Design a protein around this ligand. Structure first.
Ligand code: CLA
Ligand code: CLA
Ligand code: CLA
Ligand code: CLA
Ligand code: CLA
Ligand code: CLA
Ligand code: CLA
Ligand SMILES: CCCCCCCCCCCCCCCC(=O)OC[C@H](COP(=O)(O)OC[C@@H](O)CO)OC(=O)CCCCCCCCCCCCCCC
Ligand SMILES: CC1=C(/C=C/C(C)=C\C=C\C(C)=C\C=C\C=C(C)\C=C/C=C(C)/C=C/C2=C(C)C(=O)CCC2(C)C)C(C)(C)CCC1
Ligand SMILES: CC1=C(/C=C/C(C)=C/C=C/C(C)=C/C=C/C=C(C)/C=C/C=C(C)/C=C/C2=C(C)CCCC2(C)C)C(C)(C)CCC1
Ligand SMILES: CC1=C(C/C=C(\C)CCC[C@H](C)CCC[C@H](C)CCCC(C)C)C(=O)c2ccccc2C1=O
Ligand code: SF4
Ligand SMILES: [Cl-]
Lengths: 157, 40, 751, 141, 146, 80, 73
């Protein structure tokens, strides 16, 4: 009740922190949704976080080159997409690992097991395995798109 | 299984989405919710 | 004490002070009198520049809001008198130095001209043969087409109009003098915003279009009806004869036989022969049906007069705008529009920012609506007039918009009172300026990558012998399907969602190909991949200009870098080489950068217009029915690469400009080179800084002291702000003059 | 430096205040007393309301604190000159900063030791060639 | 100016038409039209809606030099404070975007310095200058006589 | 000719049955909706029942509104 | 189609999409003139919509979009 029908408030109750509590920044839905993504989900080991993020990213990264790459109008369309996505995930893993190497040179913190050298390295390992796996399974599903189509239509029974 | 109606590629992916993904996700959310032991 | 009239108030909210400022000439000989930092006189050359820099900065001259208001009111009268002098000059040159009657007798075989050049030092060649034995400069302002639509048939009517314009200028000048010196209205009078809005809606815009509907019905429409019927202009009665002899109207319009009775009895349909909803264009002239425009002005007048009754003044009925504003507040926006009424009734700069933004947007809307719905007889067939009017109104609109940014910033620095803006819309805008600007920043980056970057992709693919990997209508397509859908909706509208309309509002959306003489006046303007790409270029450049000016306004008070920017003012060069360097943090410098970006945006807009109209719309039509365009439909395949614009647009069409020597177009080549030179010249001021020049001036002052010729008014290098102002003024002047010469040579050399 | 006291100004929040630097590196505090609840301009954007009595506010930089201080002592009908500015570290250490010796720096106060003073003119700096391959510059010698 | 001079005169000489330079070099429209405008025709046609030839690389480099020149203009006209404040907004956005939150910079992003802006703008300007003119010189002379 | 059909001065249906009726309706909603009914410069004294009830500006404005309503309604009921 | 011959045509409710179907069931449920598996409606909804004046698929679609809006309200 009262007089505050207002939907925007000071972020975390401190009006002098440069941020605002808004329906996009700090609603219950965004808190629960962002807070349960692999990056923030409570209790997860960084290996599983990396694995999940890599699965999602490797899976979806096959598409752009698959439909729009230079081999899209060749007999090696899906292989071209796969090669592109694999090389991209390799470069991304190198970027993640270089980041971990440079930002965790000093004393290791304690609150965030992902924000350590060991944790960020585990995240990179999981991300590599998940990205390569997701890219290869997206490629495998696309390369056998006819059997997936017949499966979804019942063309085999 | 086919369809001559408009945009007949929609059941193709919506039937798996309604039968597999929607129930899996909603049951998983409700499962983690009813088991949540946060005080209150 | 000057002239003392009686009083002239009739239970009015009129309130004035009698003779506050006596008429006198002494201060005319005291330059800089209005600025205390200038009145003593000069000591350095900077004193001169600032004298011009602050001449109209009425805030910086006096802190009294009433005196500022009075200065502004009289300045407005003076400006109106200037505009009257200019317009009467146009009409006088039409009366005495034009081929207007000759053009009127045969507008398809003669080019409009209204400036004759004296023969001296060879420049007489500019008097090109425009037809009918007339020699002069071809005009692209569309004055002849306006004068024909209005129903002018004689030099003497234009001359009488010029004399009326001079008398009007004298009247405006006297009113300005009178209301500054004799009867100056009080601040209470200016703040009557409700009454001012009632009068500007019902009286200025409503009665304006009502009187013009009257002139169109009684003068324009019968005279043009006879002109398009092939009647020679000398055989047509004078405008007043249709009012003295109503049988002339009645035989041109049978509804006139019934008179005014159908009007007062709501039997308006009887008037359907002269109050029309035809749509489309006039088949004889290529312009909008004058009857349509008269019906349009009648309806606009009724609308505006009705609108002029919303606000409360002296009679209890009506609205308080303060109340309305205060009622509009929501869960997302705190106190809402509270405080806006006080801002817009005490701050001249706030009103000017709003009004500049809207007036510039309106001028742009005018360009866009007049090209595709050509309102004047024979304007669409005159491709030079079409291009020139479009681009001219574009540039005026862009300048007004940038000025709106400037004056939003000036409001923030000078008139914003934080105690009067607690948790209202302005306050919350300030309180999440970072979110706003970081997001606008990202949208501009995304729009640039996915518009210009598409062009770079296409250039690289085409150079690599890979046409099938391009973004084009024949490869990877970017169809603007929503614009195509709305065009289809407009084409279907006359038969469905606009029943009582006979034709489309514009043939650009689709339909027939309206051609007058052998040239197309208007035809369906189709949209494809190149049109998609250039529309996103437009969205990108507009977004960047908005980014710059909006950041200028929102950070004029402070930033994380400079938390006391407000104390530094609206116009200042920086706050030193510290903090890494703070040059160009002021709102003025944001306006300075936004000028360049607006110039960029509009250059691309007008190039798009020129190339698309020459490629896909304009052209000549054979008696067989087919159309052959000016640049042979090259837009779709060439406008999708930067090389295409460099070669098939700029390089190809510049051939007229650079070969203009030895003909009447020679001045356009002259001014093409002139714009180029001014552009290059601006780079000296923009790429350098005043310290170097001050030292060079030191050496030259030594040279002068050597021969005992140094001036008492010591030479100083231009200030940092002035260096930027000169640089940007010359950049815009040179570039715009270049494009102007180019456009005029092209559109005049293409049939 | 004992423990900062004072109510925070009445303010609805903004995006222009503290960032990560405040907790990772350093932040700044300004206290001041006001004879009345009244509106002032936040150096980080917008309007805020100071409480009657003591006020304590955290900002990201020393300059924002001094800008607020000038606003307090030059833009209110009865001036506010009792403001104090402190530097605050993540460890909790509070370093009193301004006014350094309890007296504003614009006016002389006994007990201050001259720093950065030179017993010469600017034109009496030594030629750079005379001090090259050293670590100094003509104004450092 | 020097290289324009040399190239236009030697074009006339090599082609046997010294008269073009002798008669049209006395006015600047002559340079603008007979030298610059004319000798671009093959250059700008290295790639086309109709195909590609051996001058494609030089047309692409011509446009590239234009683009680099124009980019240098940005560092030369817009000065630092405007950029540092914009980067402050971008810094804010990064610190407050989830997921991207996970990553933090090792060096604080700040706008380029005053002198650095002059140097980098000049470097772009000069690169574009040289590459544009080299593309034009090479392509024109090899299309006429190559 | 394709033109929306109006009506000649009916002076039975066009008048009271529409125009005067719409004017009375505007009278009613103005009586029940105008904040300042009799705060005009012009008193126009004898306050009555409806025809000239509260103030000259109330009367004039509600009558202009009734004419807008009546014009719209007459024209609409006669096709368009 | 049902509007033309309402006594000899069976109204269909919606299309079937079941990857479990074999050839026999696919054939059995391409019925009532349809070119794909379909169920026939027994809610009387065709008779209702036809009686109240609706005659085209565009009208039914506009009704369904309007009901989307009403539910939103
Ligand atoms: C019993 C009363 C009655 C009846 C039934 C009618 C009947 C009719 N009127 Mg009328 N009218 C009435 C009362 C009545 N009117 C009154 C009291 C007034 C005074 C306000 C009007 C004034 C009025 C006008 C001005 C017009 C009509 C029109 C019409 C015809 C409309 C056909 C149509 O589908 O429109 C069109 C359907 C649309 C979906 C168009 C809507 C799209 C617009 C352009 C969106 C614009 C948004 C706008 C800018 C936002 C407003 C700004 C702000 C104030 C919110 C119709 C036969 C029109 C007519 O006569 O046609 C010849 C017309 O021009 N009426
Ligand atoms: C001969 C020694 C050697 C060899 C066999 C490898 C082999 C490998 N490394 Mg390693 N690396 C080495 C030394 C070596 N590394 C050293 C000394 C460092 C410290 C600077 C690194 C740091 C490094 C990082 C951060 C990462 C790898 C990764 C990888 C794997 C990815 C494939 C690749 O990078 O291409 C083959 C590489 C070579 C033939 C050259 C090896 C020697 C140079 C100095 C390595 C430099 C690493 C470079 C920054 C990352 C390459 C980017 C990538 C796009 C190729 C691969 C099996 C990636 C990985 O997936 O790890 C799980 C990754 O994230 N390396
Ligand atoms: C409650 C009404 C309703 C019902 C019972 C159905 C039933 C069905 N629909 Mg349909 N649908 C509806 C409304 C409905 N639809 C509307 C309004 C639209 C337009 C937006 C669509 C668009 C749609 C498409 C494109 C497709 C289906 C399809 C299907 C079939 C497979 C299920 C599915 O994939 O749905 C998916 C549904 C959606 C993507 C849109 C959501 C439907 C509405 C708006 C939400 C209903 C919420 C409901 C009232 C909540 C109450 C639940 C209750 C138990 C508490 C199924 C027989 C598939 C089919 O045709 O099979 C061959 C198919 O591909 N529907
Ligand atoms: C119906 C009454 C009316 C009309 C027609 C105007 C018209 C105008 N006002 Mg004004 N104003 C009015 C009432 C009116 N005002 C009232 C009641 C107030 C007090 C609240 C103000 C206070 C006000 C201020 C403070 C300012 C204006 C300004 C302006 C001018 C700027 C717009 C412009 O340039 O357009 C186009 C210009 C023209 C069409 C030129 C014609 C101008 C002549 C003198 C008007 C003659 C019309 C007159 C009624 C005779 C018509 C009768 C017959 C010939 C048909 C404009 C001519 C601004 C200005 O420019 O100051 C000079 C200005 O700053 N008005
Ligand atoms: C400001 C613009 C303007 C100007 C000044 C004129 C000027 C003129 N018009 Mg024109 N006209 C205009 C706009 C204008 N018109 C518009 C917008 C239209 C489209 C509707 C027309 C269409 C038009 C027609 C068809 C005719 C004119 C005519 C005339 C001339 C005689 C009318 C007159 O004034 O006598 C004085 C008018 C009166 C004394 C009106 C009294 C008659 C009625 C019964 C009084 C009712 C008034 C009452 C308050 C309303 C209640 C009615 C209800 C109770 C039933 C005159 C010189 C006439 C003419 O001479 O043709 C050449 C003519 O036939 N005009
Ligand atoms: C109705 C529109 C309008 C109004 C009345 C004002 C009013 C005002 N403006 Mg604003 N502004 C406007 C539009 C407007 N402006 C536009 C369109 C722009 C974009 C360019 C700006 C951008 C702007 C800036 C950046 C500034 C102002 C400033 C000012 C104030 C000082 C005026 C002045 O400079 O004196 C004297 C005027 C001059 C010395 C102009 C001479 C130089 C011009 C540009 C040369 C033009 C060349 C010519 C057009 C073509 C070449 C001819 C040549 C070859 C001979 C004044 C109160 C100044 C201020 O401090 O505000 C308080 C200031 O800083 N305005
Ligand atoms: C052609 C010259 C040029 C170019 C390239 C730019 C570039 C840019 N300006 Mg700028 N500007 C210029 C001239 C130029 N300016 C001049 C002369 C001025 C003086 C008035 C300004 C003043 C100015 C201001 C005040 C602002 C900008 C802004 C911007 C940015 C807009 C956002 C964007 O487009 O994102 C995308 C980037 C591009 C489209 C650039 C091209 C990228 C290509 C096509 C793809 C790159 C390929 C790949 C990366 C190559 C890698 C090679 C490998 C070996 C590493 C942008 C990066 C605005 C901004 O920052 O917005 C946020 C801003 O506020 N400009
Ligand atoms: C081509 C167009 C089709 C594509 C769709 C693109 C969707 C764009 C997002 C929808 C608009 C959101 C604004 C209305 C939503 C809206 O106004 O809600 C209402 C809400 C305020 O409502 P209140 O209840 O406070 O109303 C009280 C008023 O009286 C004001 O005091 O506005 C805000 O919360 C401010 C936040 C605006 C920040 C969002 C703006 C984002 C900028 C980008 C928008 C692009 C629009 C381009 C179209 C030209
Ligand atoms: C000015 C005015 C008047 C003139 C009014 C005019 C000029 C027109 C009024 C038209 C009206 C008032 C139309 C109302 C339509 C209401 C509807 C359509 C309501 C509900 C529909 C529902 C609930 C859903 C129906 C369904 C749909 C969607 C289907 O498709 C299937 C069937 C079903 C499920 C039932 C008069 C002079 C008269 C009185 C004075 C004021
Ligand atoms: C709708 C929506 C949304 C969105 C979403 C998204 C955007 C997503 C996507 C999604 C995705 C993206 C997904 C995924 C999936 C994936 C997967 C599932 C994977 C995989 C992989 C695999 C399985 C692999 C395997 C392997 C390995 C590992 C090794 C060996 C080899 C192989 C291959 C065997 C949201 C909620 C936000 C909001 C609302 C709406
Ligand atoms: C050249 C230059 C100067 C030197 C320019 C000066 C000193 C101006 C010289 C102007 C002369 C004195 C006036 C000539 C122009 C007149 C205004 C035109 C009047 C013509 C009438 C007589 C008809 C600067 O001071 C400067 C400052 C900051 C950045 C860049 C620069 C810069 O590039
Ligand atoms: S370069 Fe000029 S503008 Fe920039 S900080 Fe230095 S003095 Fe100021
Ligand atoms: Cl090309």
């Amino acid at each position: 009740m009262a007089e505050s029908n207002q939907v925007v408030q000071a972020y975390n109750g401190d009006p002098f922190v440069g941020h605002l509590s808004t329906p996009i920044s700090d609603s219950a839905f965004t808190r629960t949704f962002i807070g349960n993504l692999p990056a923030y989900r409570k209790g997860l080991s960084p290996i599983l976080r990396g694995l999940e993020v890599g699965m999602a990213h490797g899976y979806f990264l096959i598409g752009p080159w698959t439909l729009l790459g230079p081999l899209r109008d060749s007999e090696y369309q899906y292989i071209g997409g796969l090669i592109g996505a694999l090389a991209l995930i390799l470069v991304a893993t190198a970027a993640l690992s270089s980041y971990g190497l440079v930002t965790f040179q000093g004393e290791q913190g304690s609150g965030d097991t992902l924000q350590t050298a060991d944790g960020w390295s585990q995240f990179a390992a999981g991300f590599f395995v998940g990205g390569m796996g997701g890219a290869f399974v997206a490629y495998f599903l696309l390369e056998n798109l006819s059997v997936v189509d017949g499966i979804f239509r019942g063309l085999f029974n | 299984m086919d369809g001559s109606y408009a945009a007949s590629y929609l059941p193709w992916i919506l039937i798996p989405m309604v039968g597999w993904l929607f129930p899996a996700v909603t049951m998983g959310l409700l499962f983690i919710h009813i088991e949540s032991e946060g005080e209150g | 004490m000057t002239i003392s009239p009686p009083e002239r108030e009739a239970k009015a909210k009129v309130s004035v002070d009698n003779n506050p400022v006596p008429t006198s000439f002494e201060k005319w000989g005291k330059p800089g009198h209005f600025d205390r930092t200038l009145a003593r006189g000069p000591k350095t050359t900077t004193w001169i520049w600032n004298l011009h820099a602050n001449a109209h900065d009425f805030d910086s001259q006096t802190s009294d809001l009433e005196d500022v208001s009075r200065k502004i009111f009289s300045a407005h009268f003076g400006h109106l008198a200037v505009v009257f002098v200019w317009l009467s000059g146009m009409y006088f040159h039409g009366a005495k130095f034009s081929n207007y009657e000759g053009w009127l007798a045969d507008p398809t075989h003669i080019k409009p001209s209204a400036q004759v050049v004296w023969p001296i030092v060879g420049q007489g060649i500019l008097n090109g043969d425009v037809g009918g034995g007339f020699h002069g400069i071809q005009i692209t302002s569309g004055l002849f087409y306006l004068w024909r639509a209005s129903g002018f048939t004689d030099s003497y009517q234009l001359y009488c109009t010029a004399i009326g314009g001079l008398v009007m200028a004298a009247l405006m000048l006297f009113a300005g003098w009178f209301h500054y010196h004799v009867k100056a209205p009080k601040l209470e009078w200016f703040q009557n915003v409700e009454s001012m809005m009632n009068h500007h809606l019902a009286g200025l815009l409503g009665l304006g279009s009502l009187g013009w509907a009257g002139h169109q019905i009684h003068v324009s429409m019968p005279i043009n009806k006879l002109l398009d019927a092939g009647v020679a202009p000398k055989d047509i009665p004078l405008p007043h004869e249709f009012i003295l002899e109503p049988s002339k109207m009645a035989e041109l319009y049978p509804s006139f036989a019934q008179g005014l009775t159908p009007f007062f009895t709501l039997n308006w349909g009887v008037y359907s022969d002269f109050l029309t909803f035809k749509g489309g264009l006039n088949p004889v002239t290529g312009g909008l049906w004058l009857s349509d425009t008269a019906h349009h002005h009648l309806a606009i007048a009724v609308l505006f007069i009705i609108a002029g009754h919303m606000y409360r003044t002296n009679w209890g009925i009506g609205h308080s705008m303060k109340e309305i504003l205060e009622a509009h507040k929501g869960p997302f926006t705190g106190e809402g529009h509270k405080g806006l009424y006080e801002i817009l009734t005490t701050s001249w700069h706030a009103q000017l920012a709003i009004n500049l933004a809207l007036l510039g947007s309106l001028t742009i809307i005018v360009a866009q609506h007049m090209y595709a719905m050509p309102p004047y007889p024979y304007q669409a067939i005159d491709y030079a007039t079409q291009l020139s009017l479009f681009t001219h109104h574009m540039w005026i609109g862009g300048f007004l918009i940038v000025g709106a940014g400037a004056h939003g910033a000036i409001f923030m620095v000078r008139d914003y009172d934080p105690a009067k803006n607690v948790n209202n819309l302005l306050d919350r805008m300030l309180r999440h300026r970072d979110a706003i600007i970081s997001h606008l920043n990202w949208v501009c980056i995304f729009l640039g990558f996915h518009s210009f970057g598409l062009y770079i992709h296409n250039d690289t693919m085409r150079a690599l012998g890979r046409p099938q990997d391009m973004f084009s209508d024949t490869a990877i397509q970017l169809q603007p399907i929503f614009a195509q859908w709305v065009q289809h909706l407009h084409t279907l509208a006359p038969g469905a969602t606009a029943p009582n309309a006979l034709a489309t509002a514009s043939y650009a959306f689709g339909g027939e190909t309206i051609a007058v003489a052998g040239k197309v006046a208007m035809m369906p303007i189709t949209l494809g991949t190149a049109d998609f790409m250039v529309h996103h270029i437009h969205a990108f450049t507009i977004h960047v200009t908005a980014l710059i000016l909006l950041k200028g306004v929102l950070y004029a008070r402070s930033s994380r870098l400079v938390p006391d920017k407000a104390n530094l003012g609206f116009r200042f060069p920086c706050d030193g080489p510290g903090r890494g360097g703070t040059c160009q943090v002021s709102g003025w410098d944001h306006v300075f950068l936004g000028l360049f970006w607006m110039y960029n945006s509009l250059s691309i807009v007008i190039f798009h217009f020129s190339w698309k109209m020459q490629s896909d719309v304009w052209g000549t039509v054979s008696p067989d029915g087919s159309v052959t365009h000016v640049t042979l439909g090259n837009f779709a395949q060439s406008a999708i690469t930067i090389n295409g614009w460099l070669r098939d647009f700029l390089w190809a069409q510049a051939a007229n400009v650079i070969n203009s020597y030895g003909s009447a177009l020679s001045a356009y080549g002259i001014m093409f080179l002139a714009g180029h030179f001014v552009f290059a010249f601006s780079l000296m001021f923009l790429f350098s800084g005043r310290g170097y020049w001050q030292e060079l001036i030191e050496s030259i002052v030594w040279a002068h002291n050597k021969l005992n010729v140094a001036p008492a008014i010591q030479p100083r290098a231009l200030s940092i702000i002035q260096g930027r102002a000169v640089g940007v003024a010359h950049y815009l002047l040179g570039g715009i003059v270049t494009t102007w010469a180019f456009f005029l040579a092209r559109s005049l050399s293409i049939g | 430096m004992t423990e900062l006291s004072g109510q925070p100004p009445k303010f609805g929040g903004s995006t222009g205040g503290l960032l990560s630097k405040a907790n990772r590196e350093e932040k700044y505090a300004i206290t001041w007393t006001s004879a009345s609840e009244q509106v002032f301009e936040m150096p980080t954007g917008g309007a805020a309301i100071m409480n009657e009595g003591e006020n304590l506010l955290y900002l990201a930089r020393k300059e924002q604190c001094l800008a607020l201080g000038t606003q307090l002592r030059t833009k209110f009908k009865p001036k506010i000159q009792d403001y104090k500015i402190y530097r605050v570290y993540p460890s909790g250490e509070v370093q009193y900063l301004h006014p350094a010796d309890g007296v504003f720096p614009e006016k002389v106060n006994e007990g201050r030791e001259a720093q950065g003073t030179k017993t010469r003119r600017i034109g009496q700096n030594p030629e750079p060639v005379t001090i090259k391959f050293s670590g100094k510059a003509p104004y450092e010698v | 100016w020097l290289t324009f001079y040399w190239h236009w005169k030697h074009l006339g000489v090599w082609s046997g038409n010294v008269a073009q330079f002798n008669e049209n070099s006395t006015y600047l429209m002559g340079w603008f039209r007979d030298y610059l405008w004319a000798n671009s025709a093959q250059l700008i046609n290295g790639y086309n809606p109709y195909g590609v030839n051996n001058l494609s690389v030089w047309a692409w480099m011509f446009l590239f030099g234009h683009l680099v020149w124009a980019t240098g203009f940005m560092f030369l006209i817009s000065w630092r404070g405007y950029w540092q404040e914009l980067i402050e907004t971008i810094v804010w956005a990064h610190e407050r975007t989830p997921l991207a939150n996970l990553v933090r910079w090792k060096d604080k992003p700040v706008a380029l310095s005053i002198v650095q802006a002059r140097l980098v703008g000049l470097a772009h300007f000069t690169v574009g200058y040289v590459l544009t003119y080299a593309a034009f010189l090479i392509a024109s002379t090899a299309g006429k006589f190559g | 000719l394709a033109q929306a059909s109006p009506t000649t001065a009916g002076w039975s249906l066009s008048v009271g049955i529409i125009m005067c009726l719409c004017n009375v309706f505007a009278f009613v909603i103005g009586y029940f909706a105008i904040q300042k009914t009799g705060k005009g410069k012009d008193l126009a004294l004898p306050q009555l029942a409806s025809k000239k009830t509260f103030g000259l500006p109330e009367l004039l404005a509600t009558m202009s509104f009734g004419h807008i309503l009546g014009a719209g309604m007459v024209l609409g009921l006669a096709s368009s | 189609q049902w509007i033309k011959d309402p006594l000899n045509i069976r109204p269909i409710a919606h299309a079937i999409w079941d990857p479990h179907f074999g050839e026999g069931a696919v054939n059995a449920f391409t019925q009532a003139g349809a070119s794909n598996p379909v169920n026939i409606a027994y809610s009387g909804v065709y008779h209702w919509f036809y009686t109240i004046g609706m005659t085209t698929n565009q009208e039914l679609y506009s009704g369904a979009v309007f009901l989307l809006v009403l539910a939103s309200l």
